Write a protein that binds this ligand. Structure first.
Ligand SMILES: *[C@@H]1O[C@H](CO)[C@@H](O)[C@H](O)[C@H]1NC(C)=O
Ligand SMILES: [Ca+2]
Lengths: 238, 136, 120
């Protein structure tokens, strides 16, 4: 996260750090005690193997994410229509081997319902352990920042992303830059508050540079994917 | 699709809306029978797709209780999760409802509801399947 | 962790090469090491990966059976033995960790490698 601030304990209790061989690789968002929403570009081969992945919840610092303090991942499911070249349908699910214990530090975020009626420049938050500067290293501390939705019409203009933003993507950030997601934030939450509830509306998907002007962050449009998400959870339960 | 047909996800198979959520799996992956329950809007109005009317309708509060709400949550994939439920005034502009058949038998939750033009309780079910979206 | 790939060169079709990946940094961050390649104008392609204990390896379909990935842990060096090379294998080959190869910016280029050319 570029241009944000450190997060307090419990500020973003759905945020998890997803590790490959005990090293942070991607962020994710808790939606049930066992299901985590993340990005499909985090789990392309050979990272489609759940054996590699552990999730860390309720822990703000990478150095406190010890081998054995994490939840082993049992299943990794990428969106069936994920296209890596275009980044289209960039969403995935991870199922944990055992349920999380919800408390003050670990809580789920709500899946968005049809008819949220979000504002064109809805106020949102991003969080993650990504770099705080372009070309920077993974952040030791969980950060978070305020970003605004950017209408897909404006984001697809010739001087921004030039018709690369599909209906499965949403833009957020600032056309003037300075505040953005960055390398290491992939898969993490883009959330918004409405009716006094925090909703998961995006997962950090791609970008060009970090916090550069006319290159805002692009996120998977979670609203489009909820039918697929419910189908996955329903099929798992019985 | 043609003639207001509904596409089975992205499979290229379109079926008549009267066969959407009708208890028989007509789609290649059963897409027509596994997304028949949803929560609408920021106030979680419980809606069920009616195969008779070919549209979504809010669930009438009549005879509804937590057992039925938990079945709805399970149909959406929430397994044993349940948080809250309330009868509220409808504000989604609905002109009819899905009403509970108390003697419906042991079927899917959406097949225990039939289309009805009025709720006796004058309220629709608001359903929350999991305690989510709260921070500091 | 800092990585330095080497061992590339120009070879004939059917020839062989052996690439090395020297790593410096904490070994606890090298539990999964990978090789990927990129030809001019083409998208980068993942090639192979290996677990630190060598109990698990991975190969892309395009190189399976012809490439072999291995490790020498007394030197923290990852090797890529490339046999039966074809012209379609021409690219710059890089080694990386998951925290490096999983990129929010797909066209970012902070990933230095070794050039491999196959041509008669
Ligand atoms: C309720 O279900 C029973 C048992 O299947 C059926 O006989 C009856 O007609 C149903 N009632 C309504 C109003 O559809
Ligand atoms: Ca049907």
């Amino acid at each position: 996260i570029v241009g944000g601030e450190s997060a307090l304990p419990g500020a973003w209790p759905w945020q998890v750090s997803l590790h490959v061989q005990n090293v942070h690789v991607c962020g994710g968002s808790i939606i049930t005690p066992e299901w985590i929403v993340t990005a499909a570009h985090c789990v392309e081969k050979p990272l489609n193997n759940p054996w590699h992945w552990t999730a860390f919840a309720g822990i703000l610092r990478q150095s406190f994410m010890f081998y054995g303090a994490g939840y082993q991942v049992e299943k990794v499911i990428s969106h069936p229509n994920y296209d890596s070249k275009t980044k289209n349908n960039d969403i995935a699910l991870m199922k944990l081997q055992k349920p999380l214990t919800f408390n003050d530090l670990v809580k789920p975020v709500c899946l968005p319902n049809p008819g949220m009626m979000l504002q064109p420049e809805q106020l949102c938050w991003i969080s993650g352990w990504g770099a705080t500067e372009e070309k920077g290293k993974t952040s030791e501390v969980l950060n978070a920042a305020k970003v605004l939705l950017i209408e897909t019409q404006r984001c697809n203009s010739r001087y921004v992303y030039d018709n690369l933003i599909t209906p499965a993507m949403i833009c957020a950030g600032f056309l003037q830059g300075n505040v953005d997601s960055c390398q290491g934030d992939s898969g993490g939450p883009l959330v918004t508050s409405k009716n006094n509830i925090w909703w998961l509306i995006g997962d950090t998907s791609w970008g060009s540079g970090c916090a550069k002007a006319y290159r805002p962050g692009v996120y998977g449009n979670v609203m489009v994917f909820t039918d697929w998400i419910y189908r996955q959870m329903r099929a798992d339960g019985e | 699709c043609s003639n207001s047909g509904i596409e089975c996800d992205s499979s290229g198979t379109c079926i008549n809306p009267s066969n959407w959520c009708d208890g028989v799996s007509h789609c290649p992956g059963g897409e027509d029978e596994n997304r028949c329950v949803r929560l609408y809007g920021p106030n979680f109005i419980l809606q069920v797709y009616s195969s008779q009317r070919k549209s979504w309708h809010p669930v009438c509060q009549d005879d509804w209780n937590e057992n039925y709400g938990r079945a709805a949550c399970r149909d959406m994939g929430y397994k044993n999760n349940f948080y809250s439920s309330q009868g509220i005034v409808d504000d989604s502009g609905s002109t009819s409802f899905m009403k509970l058949n108390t003697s419906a038998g042991n079927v899917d939750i959406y097949k225990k509801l039939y289309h009805s033009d009025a709720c006796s309780s004058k309220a629709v079910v608001s359903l929350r399947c999991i305690a989510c979206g709260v921070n500091l | 962790v800092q990585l330095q790939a080497s061992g590339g060169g120009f070879v004939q079709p059917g020839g062989s090469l052996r690439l090395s990946c020297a790593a410096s940094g904490k070994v606890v961050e090298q539990g999964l090491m990978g090789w990927f390649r990129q030809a001019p104008g083409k998208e980068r392609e993942f090639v192979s990966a290996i677990q630190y204990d060598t109990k698990l390896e991975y190969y892309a379909d395009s190189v399976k059976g012809r490439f072999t990935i291995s490790r020498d842990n007394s030197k923290n060096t990852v090797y890529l033995q490339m046999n039966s090379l074809r012209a379609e294998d021409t690219a710059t080959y890089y080694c990386a960790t998951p925290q490096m190869w999983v990129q929010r910016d797909r066209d970012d280029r902070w990933y230095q490698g070794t050039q491999v050319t196959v041509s008669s």
